[PDB]
[3-methyl-2-oxobutanoate dehydrogenase [lipoamide]] kinase, mitochondrial (Rattus norvegicus), 620 residues
Amino acid sequence: VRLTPTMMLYSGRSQDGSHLLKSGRYLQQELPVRIAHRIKGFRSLPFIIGCNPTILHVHELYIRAFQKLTDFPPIKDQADEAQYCQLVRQLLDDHKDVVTLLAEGLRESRKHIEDEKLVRYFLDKTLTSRLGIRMLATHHLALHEDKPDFVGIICTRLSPKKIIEKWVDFARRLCEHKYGNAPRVRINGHVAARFPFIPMPLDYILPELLKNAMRATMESHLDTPYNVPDVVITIANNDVDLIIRISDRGGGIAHKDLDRVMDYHFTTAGFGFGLPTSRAYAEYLGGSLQLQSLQGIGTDVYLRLRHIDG
Amino acid sequence: VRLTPTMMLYSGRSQDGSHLLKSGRYLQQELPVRIAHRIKGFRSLPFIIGCNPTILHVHELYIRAFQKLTDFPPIKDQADEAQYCQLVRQLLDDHKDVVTLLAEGLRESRKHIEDEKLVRYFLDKTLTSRLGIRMLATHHLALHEDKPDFVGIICTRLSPKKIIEKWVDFARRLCEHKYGNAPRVRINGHVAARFPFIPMPLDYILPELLKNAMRATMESHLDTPYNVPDVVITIANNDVDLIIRISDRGGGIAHKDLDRVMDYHFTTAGFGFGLPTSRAYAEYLGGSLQLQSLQGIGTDVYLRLRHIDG
Ligand SMILES: Nc1ncnc2c1ncn2[C@@H]1O[C@H](COP(=O)(O)OP(=O)(O)O)[C@@H](O)[C@H]1O
Ligand SMILES: Nc1ncnc2c1ncn2[C@@H]1O[C@H](COP(=O)(O)OP(=O)(O)O)[C@@H](O)[C@H]1O
Ligand SMILES: CC(C)C[C@H](Cl)C(=O)O
Ligand SMILES: CC(C)C[C@H](Cl)C(=O)O
Ligand SMILES: [K+]
Ligand SMILES: [K+]
Ligand SMILES: [Mg+2]
Ligand SMILES: [Mg+2]
């Protein structure tokens, strides 16, 4: 029953399966209201942006979802609950490319307005609400599964080192595929820590930060691709939060780019969403994402995520 | 002729010694106005604080200095200039303990007022103005000296690694004297950098940050004083600024203390002035001082100082 902001992840264990029903009914009351807020967000977008065909498509997707959700009959039994899950699974899949569609839709249209704070706010609000909604929805679905060491999407004994290693292997492959090599990653600090935690946000954030650090490292070592400085990751685990520091020797973020890197769409090269999205996600969950640039040397990125209150 | 804020450090080279006169005359016009501002600062202190006998003593010192400075006759020749230097040297020495007197005077008296922003502002403004004044004054005196690789107090080829090493040896001695041992310090990054720079601010700041990192390291390793994690210092030198990162494995700054550590007087133990003073000095010179705490692991402190414009 651990909560994200104004949102609650049910921990329940009833052999009869009545927690599924209480969970299902909660989801059913909650999803339409939150989808309505997203729709209100689209309605208030500057006209010229809202008229972009890709933005209109996403706008329609949300209306469609609101329609199907409200059309679904109140849940009275396992049979209803079971069918609601099919709808939720369908919606989750239908909406899996939303971040990318928004990025495309907004890329050009955003420069047609005078106030630039506007799109930042819309995206921060839309993407984090969406993260919140997908977490709740996926958590409900997960309550059906019998994975050990999970209560829904909540890992009961998450190892930060393990999940970091997972995304390191992933980022290294992408990097090897593009450059013929990848920095090695060293992990230090509280490497043996284990605690209850929701992987989902880490699954978004970590690969974004690792891809950044690896790209920077390779692009600054073009003469010695076979011998590049390691990326060093430090884990700090205390009673308040989990801190993951990702340090590279990739030459740093230039002074002229520093005020831009947190802007959606800004890139010196994906589509420039990695940093602002990651920060918005971390702040939404009560944490933060901070950068320290050592121009000429490299960058330290500090991810902080609050622990699950007990 | 490199400048600090609203203040100018004369680079001059006249064999006849006329730059000494132009410098002297500049100092003579500039010191009284700036001392007057400091006096105005004392006049506007909350009554109950201004009545503290130590605060009153410092207040009087500044009046006395204004008196002697204004009483000094306009400078028309080397003889006048030469005598002005004696006065400046006397004043510099008379005022050498001002930071410490202010700290004592304010320690108790400050809690007697409702607005806490007040003392922070007074101290930030008083201490940085004082740094500015001492730099100009000392720079003038230094123009008389014939040290090679100096133009006044400006080192023409400052090595960050060398000046860091100087203060490392110093901090290690203090630390060894108190704990029987001291962390080793490793220095990496742009270790061979050399550039024109004014040592004075580094001479204040570095020992403060080194003492902090060493204390934290020892106090968190009481069982293994003979084997403690190194302090690691990274130098980054680029065209805009010099960055010095000081990282320790001293266990970090606790969440409950984090909002306090930049307050004058706050200490978990000198007199709690190291951090706020160092930050005020760095910002005054166009740089910054930022902390990243990894609670349970350690702390990274980032000092940034702008280069001398050319
Ligand atoms: N670790 C890093 N080192 C150097 N530059 C970085 C680092 N992380 C981000 N940046 C800079 O910030 C920009 C924004 O990154 P991001 O938001 O992830 O979008 P993208 O990776 O698509 O460019 C990058 O294009 C890059 O110039
Ligand atoms: N590197 C560090 N590691 C852990 N704690 C630190 C560090 N630097 C500063 N602190 C904390 O911040 C407080 C304020 O430090 P400072 O302003 O230098 O005053 P003082 O050193 O006199 O306490 C210290 O008492 C200490 O608790
Ligand atoms: C209707 C929901 C499940 C869709 C979420 Cl808000 C998303 O865009 O992925
Ligand atoms: C009169 C000057 C030289 C004194 C400076 Cl402002 C200081 O307090 O040290
Ligand atoms: K970006
Ligand atoms: K302090
Ligand atoms: Mg990226
Ligand atoms: Mg100190």
Summary: Residues 107 and 265 of chain B are 7 Å apart (CA to CA).
